[PDB]
């Protein structure tokens, strides 16, 4: 993985010494070649995970997420120099450095072999995101955002650390391959119940589960766009990925304690969706939609069914792409209006036809229009849940319904109407954002064409 | 402003007879019943007591609302019809035409030139019209929703540009 | 109640402004000036085959429209998808599957040559 790690690390000196004008160009292009190199990592052996070294390995679950992060890295670079144009060169270089360190930590996380190293980099993603959210944020509760986000993450992270070190003392090693091959049945002891809770609740905090999901409507809504997309697209996937890794040594106990959280998500995905309907801000609506989709992924994880795992992975990838695109579109409109209430600027479909389209298939993919990978990922989870329990369907059946409502509602109330007369700053569509939504959208349908890649390790 | 009794009965007659048109459908029925209702209205104009006249209006509105058409006719372009707000998807704000690329501008050259002179009208008229609305503002806050005139010569009447440059009835 | 001269002065002032703006909305003889464009010689030949005004020439202009339509829209599909079917799709098992045709008594099968044996007499009912 050092064919991807070493270039990512060496990307830091390039930006840190590039001229006052070349930082954006150089970072964008070289991150694009980094994504190209990581495109190779989609090469997967039939059943054996690709073990590059002792400390680094990859399989059909880590590789798609890694490719997602590496391909994403140019996208924040393209979305940031709009709101980062009027800044000192050193400050811009550090913003870029925060982004590269974030991507590097995500790569080491996804390619980590020992659970402790996975925890180290997984949590270590907090710091660059914290700096991005706090310093470069524009709204008020950004300072409150950082506190909420850090403390919510850590409150689950530390018990996970205690559980992992206890596992190391008892089992012998935290290596994934060992704990899977040398896996042993888990007894229904209450100490084992608390161990399962410690191993689960950190990822479920970052999932998020309903109830303890307040860090997203107070974090993604406030972060700069680059931070917002890197949060929603991948950082949410950290908990799902960790759960998929950890349920190997968390059975057969899970089912007995699967009952509270599963429905907590199942019911929660309704409320969040309902919360999406009666929203006032675009970014908050997208954040709550992300919460609902991630709750569906939670249900997929706790079913522990092959089909559930494949649908889960597909939903993570598709949701990352769709949420990043929706946040980018919201930023474009907000910057054009310097406000975020989704009533101030409506009826812009005529003014910006390409934005009107980009919003149209962004909503369609968010609404999971078949045969997009969003729809197949959702439907696989629906079928797995129905096999696990029939009634789930109606709740599932409710979700996209309400989702569809808001999935079109903002499009009705932001572009499908009459323009506001007193505003005039809406200029011609700068081709930067249009191109950015292109690099968002075309890979989505490309993966729709061949979903065997994002299908996960169960395929 | 305030709804005087004559206004409240003019609206009553309008609503009642348009609903009668929706009811009787055919034009000869509408003519007969409309003349009959015109008589039924003008027969008792001489209600001296304003309270009694308003009570008769109570009865008239009550019975009309009980018998108003369950599907009154509304013309399309008018509020409620099929062509209502159907042309909004075509009208574009005028200030967008300051955004056209120099190629787009030169491909429609003389219209941009006349927009330039209209813009000059707007600039030279803004200060004149703001001081005009200032001098004849109701002292200490505007009183009525009315709009102040261009009493002097050549001054563009205050608050004119958006009405003048309003998107046409048929932008297309 | 009410078209007062105070409000009149506004109304026909706005009238003459609005009208002159609408005269401005009217385009001009040079409008719309169109930037110069290259034209391929084949459509020069085709518009010269359209200028003469003859009936047969107009008819064959539109039938050549239909002919290029046929070759580039309804002939290249039967090219490519037949190439795909008979040599790629049909070459693999069960990709193309057809029900056995309804073989009635007294019918000859091509391969076997046998005529399916006839059935006993019909009840010879008549209305």
């Amino acid at each position: 993985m050092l064919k991807i790690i070493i270039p990512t690390t060496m990307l830091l000196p390039m930006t840190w010494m590039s001229k006052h004008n070349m930082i954006w160009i150089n970072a964008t292009v070289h991150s694009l070649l980094i994504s190209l190199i990581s495109l190779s990592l989609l090469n997967q052996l039939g059943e054996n995970s690709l073990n590059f070294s002792l400390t680094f390995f990859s399989d059909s679950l880590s590789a798609p997420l890694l490719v997602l992060t590496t391909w994403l890295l140019p996208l924040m670079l393209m979305a940031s120099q709009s709101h980062l144009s009027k800044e000192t060169t050193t400050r811009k270089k550090l913003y870029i450095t925060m982004l590269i360190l974030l991507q590097l930590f995500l790569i080491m996380t996804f390619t980590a072999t020992e659970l402790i190293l996975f925890y180290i980099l997984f949590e270590a993603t907090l710091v660059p995101t914290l700096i991005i959210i706090t310093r470069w944020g524009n709204q008020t509760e950004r300072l409150n955002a950082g506190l909420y986000f850090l403390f919510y993450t850590l409150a689950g992270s530390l018990p996970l650390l205690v559980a992992l070190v206890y596992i190391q003392n008892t089992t012998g090693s935290l290596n994934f391959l060992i704990i899977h091959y040398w896996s042993h049945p888990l007894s229904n002891s209450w100490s084992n119940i608390f161990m399962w809770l410690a191993c689960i609740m950190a990822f479920m905090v970052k999932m998020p589960l309903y109830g303890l999901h307040l860090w997203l409507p107070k974090a993604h809504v406030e972060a700069p766009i680059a931070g917002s997309m890197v949060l929603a697209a991948v950082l949410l996937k950290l908990g799902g990925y960790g759960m998929m890794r950890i349920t190997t040594i968390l059975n057969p106990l899970t089912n007995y304690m699967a009952y509270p959280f599963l429905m907590l998500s199942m019911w929660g995905m309704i409320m969040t969706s309902s919360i999406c309907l009666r929203q006032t801000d675009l970014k908050s609506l997208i954040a709550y939609s992300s919460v609902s989709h991630m709750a569906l992924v939670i249900v997929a994880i706790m079913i522990q069914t092959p089909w559930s795992f494949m649908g889960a992975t597909a939903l993570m990838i598709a949701h990352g792409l769709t949420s990043s695109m929706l946040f980018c579109l919201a930023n474009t409109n907000y910057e054009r209006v310097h406000s975020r209430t989704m009533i101030l600027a409506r009826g812009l479909q005529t003014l910006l036809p390409l934005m009107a389209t980009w919003w149209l298939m962004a909503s369609l993919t968010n609404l999971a229009l078949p045969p997009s990978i969003n729809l197949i990922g959702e439907l696989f989870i629906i079928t797995a849940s129905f096999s696990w329990s029939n009634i789930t369907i109606i709740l599932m059946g409710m979700n996209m319904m309400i989702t569809a409502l808001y999935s079109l509602y903002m499009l009705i109330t932001t572009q499908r109407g009459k323009y506001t007369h007193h505003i005039n700053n809406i200029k011609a569509s700068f081709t930067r954002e249009n191109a950015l939504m292109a690099l968002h959208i075309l890979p989505l349908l490309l993966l729709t064409l061949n979903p065997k890649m994002i299908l996960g390790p169960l395929y | 402003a305030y709804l005087t009794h004559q206004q409240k009965v003019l609206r009553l007659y309008k609503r009642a007879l348009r609903h009668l048109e929706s009811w009787c459908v055919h034009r000869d029925k509408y003519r007969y019943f409309a003349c009959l209702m015109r008589a039924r209205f003008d027969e008792h104009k001489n209600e001296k007591d304003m309270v009694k006249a308003t009570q008769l209006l109570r009865q008239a509105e009550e019975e009309f609302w009980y018998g108003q058409h369950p599907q009154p006719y509304i013309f399309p372009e008018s509020p409620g019809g099929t062509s209502y707000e159907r042309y909004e998807c075509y009208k574009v704000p005028e200030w967008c035409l300051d955004d056209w690329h120099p190629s787009e501008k030169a491909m429609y050259p003389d219209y941009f030139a006349k927009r330039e002179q209209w813009k000059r009208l707007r600039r030279e008229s803004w200060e004149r019209e703001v001081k005009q609305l200032q001098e004849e503002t109701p002292p200490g806050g505007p009183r009525t929703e009315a709009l102040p005139p261009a009493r002097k010569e050549g001054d563009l009447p205050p608050l004119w540009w958006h009405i003048v440059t309003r998107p046409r009835e048929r932008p297309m | 109640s009410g078209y007062t001269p105070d409000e009149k002065l506004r109304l026909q002032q706005l009238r003459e402004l609005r009208r002159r703006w609408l005269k401005d909305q009217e385009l001009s003889p040079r409008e719309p000036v169109l930037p110069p464009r290259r034209v391929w010689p084949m459509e020069q030949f085709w518009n010269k085959f359209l200028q003469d005004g003859a009936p047969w020439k107009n008819v064959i202009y539109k039938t050549y429209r239909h002919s290029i339509f046929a070759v580039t829209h309804v002939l290249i599909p039967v090219w490519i998808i037949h190439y795909y079917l008979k040599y790629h799709v049909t070459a693999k098992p069960y990709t193309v599957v057809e029900r056995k045709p309804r073989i009635f008594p007294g019918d000859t099968i091509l391969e076997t040559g046998e005529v399916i044996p006839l059935m006993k007499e019909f009840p010879d009912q008549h209305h």
Binding site: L352 | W100 | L27
Partner: peptide, 12 residues
């Protein structure tokens, strides 16, 4: 008689 067409700038 053809009136003016007020459209967003489609060049970009």
């Amino acid at each position: 008689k053809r009136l003016f067409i007020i459209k967003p700038s489609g060049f970009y």
